[PDB]
Amino acid sequence: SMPFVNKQFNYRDPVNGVDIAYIKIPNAGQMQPVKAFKIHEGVWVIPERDTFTNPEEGDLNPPPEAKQVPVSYYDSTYLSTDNEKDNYLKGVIKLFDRIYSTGLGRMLLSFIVKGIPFWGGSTIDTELKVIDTNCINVIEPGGSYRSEELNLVITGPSADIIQFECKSFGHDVFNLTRNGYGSTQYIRFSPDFTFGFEEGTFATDPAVTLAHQLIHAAHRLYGIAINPNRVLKVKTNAYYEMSGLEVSFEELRTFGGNDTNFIDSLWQKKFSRDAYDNLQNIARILNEAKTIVGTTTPLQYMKNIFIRKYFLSEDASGKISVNKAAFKEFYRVLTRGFTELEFVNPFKVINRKTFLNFDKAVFRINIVPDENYTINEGFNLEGANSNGQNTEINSRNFTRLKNFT
Amino acid sequence: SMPFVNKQFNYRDPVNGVDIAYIKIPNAGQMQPVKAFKIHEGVWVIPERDTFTNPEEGDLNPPPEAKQVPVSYYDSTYLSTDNEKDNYLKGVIKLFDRIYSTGLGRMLLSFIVKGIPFWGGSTIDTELKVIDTNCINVIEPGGSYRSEELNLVITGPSADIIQFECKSFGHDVFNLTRNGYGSTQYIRFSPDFTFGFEESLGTFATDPAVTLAHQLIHAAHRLYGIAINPNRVLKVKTNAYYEMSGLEVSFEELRTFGGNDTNFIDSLWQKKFSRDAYDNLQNIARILNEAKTIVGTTTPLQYMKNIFIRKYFLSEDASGKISVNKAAFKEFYRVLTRGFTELEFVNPFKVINRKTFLNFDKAVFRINIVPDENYTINEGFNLEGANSNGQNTEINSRNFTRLKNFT
Ligand SMILES: [Zn+2]
Ligand SMILES: [Zn+2]
């Protein structure tokens, strides 16, 4: 019942340079400042359509029908008015509160908040330094600017309104999402739409959809995401030779349950070994660090951030190391405790059972009013059932916009 | 506690032409007669190696070792002596009694006994006639034979002892297993071996009653003509240089196993399979309504119509017109496809079991279930208590002799 977001935010609240500010994303060259809200330590929400993180995706034009995929939805006017942005902000906040009301969501969000990208940006071996792509540029009242570290940004979707994804900026030398370091994560997401599926009789709770992307973000903030070149190719058609479906190992892991079982035990051992090896490397770097630059935080306090992040051990002499048992639990939580299917019962929802059950339609929803959707029950306000997710019974809460069939 | 098999059978019991006789399968061209036991109405057991249903698999020769797959087991001497065939016979009967001791198995076996293959074999549209794939020839004193209908035959395995499967004749040219008609089913099976597996990630052994129930579920689907087309398959592949082998599993197998595997079948496929089965019952209803004669039997036409009215849970109105009731079909189809799964038997049998096909068996073990000190009708291997220590191949090591690992 403790909320994740400890104060009320309205889109029209005046900027203050602290938790309501105009910001710019350093890797986005051509952007004008956008109003953003720091809803929790390290977590910002930008209630705008994402035209700025990627130069190529800088417009909201729907492609020609022949280039569209069936599972997509376009509306260039969505999220253009202040009333819409206020509703978007409140809906995203409500979902974080819903996630945080479960034991598992509390653990997921604590990992995310603790998951400071590693300070591995110095060329000098004994010196800790931030990596500049894990910051935003904050505009302050008075015309002054500052750089500020953060872990997670939620933005509105790009052109395709239902293409939810978790992305981050790259490094010239490191694969930050896979070398244990982590990097600031940017999630495209909308609380104003959800998908329908059949046992489109039932609507997905948008809290599950956000939790899914937050699991990708946690994997990527802890630098243990599976290489996107590890992929499973699926066919259910005896006739199409080439045509089929492709799903990454990272997606099989993140979804969980029986889908993860498509990943061989030998791959799991390898990923575990690799993540353990990368923690050992980070410990060596922390042990060899003697100076720190770009902050007034003392060196030991900065080391402690990562001792806590990676559940590292420290002995009497200050030597940092990886405890095998602590790593085992750390890795289990991140890869097996945090899955989409593990959230189904804590949320008390009905949900898709596998990636092979494709969404059938997209619906408009409005979760901000408590008579429609609550923190503790989502759509299922009336009782301990999934009638609230039934798009026929509870039809007033789900307006069908497009079928994918 | 009532058994499925209401009398005792010994392999050496003298033939009697009724429930112990030498038989020939008409669709198996070159087979010599084999001793068979009618353990229940419509159900026969042939306690010998299957060298006769398929002439090409008429030998027990182990293929060249270089040609063998890891998941296989060969022993040309298994089931060669009368003592072995007797032990096989009694073990299969014991598993039927174990299945029959559960409410769900009793329902499954009731569907199997009632599931007479449809009499749709006539060249004339208005005439009911048997289809020849659904009979055996029973040898009588004097060497002459008579034709007798049946639903199910259990035989010993062919060359590969652990290749358990449910098969039927005319599968190449007929669609009897998918058009609602059904056909007599032949199961290769052994109660003398079972598989070991590890709890989800060969410490635990599968209860052979679960394995037989699995094959009987295939048989029920095929006796009711609702089997999913075997070209409906789930195929997964990775890069060709990856050690981990791609996989192939039919939709029919995903359905039969149950649980989370069935969820890999998209709802749109499920709706189609249901619609197809409903349409095929409408065809059967139309054929029964238009039937005016019956041939090859003194059973009156109306009695045979009633047999299939009951089989398919068809409705009759005041005028005698047969039709499919939507609610009756929905329940009919649910029972056959959702009620009868391998995983639905796990708790009735009180066993530990694999949860998915993606958890592959690790080994094959020799077992001996006939002695009650090893395995009972009501408890299987788990004699000790309400646990699965009886299935632990380490604790209960005396009941599981490891023969081959598949890794
Ligand atoms: Zn995903
Ligand atoms: Zn099967």
Residue numbers in the entry:
A (entry chain A): 2 to 200, 213 to 418
B (entry chain B): 2 to 202, 213 to 418
Paper text:
Catalytically inactive recombinant LC/A3 spanning residues Pro2–Lys417 and containing the double mutation Glu224Gln/Phe336Tyr was produced with an N-terminal cleavable 6xHis tag by bacterial expression (for details, see experimental procedures). Crystals suitable for the determination of the high-resolution structure of LC/A3 grew within 1–2 weeks, diffracted to 2.0 Å resolution and belong to the space group P212121, with two molecules per asymmetric unit. The LC/A3 structure represents the typical globular BoNT-LC domain fold with a conserved groove that extends from the catalytic site around the enzyme. The electron density is well defined for all residues, with the exception of loop 200 (amino acid residues Ser201-Ala212 and Glu203-Ala203 of chain A and B, respectively), which is likely to be disordered. BoNT/A3 is the subtype with the least conserved LC among subtypes and shares 81.9% sequence identity with LC/A1. The overall structural organization of the LPH region, however, is conserved between LC/A1 and LC/A3. Our structure also confirms the observation of Pellett et al. that the LPH region in LC/A3 contains a cluster of basic amino acids that is absent in LC/A1 (20). In our structure loop 250 has a different conformation and points away from the active site. This different orientation of loop 250 may explain the inability of LC/A3 to undergo autocleavage. However, the observation that their catalytic pockets are virtually identical and other substrate-binding residues are largely conserved suggests that LC/A3 may accommodate SNAP-25 in a similar way as LC/A1.
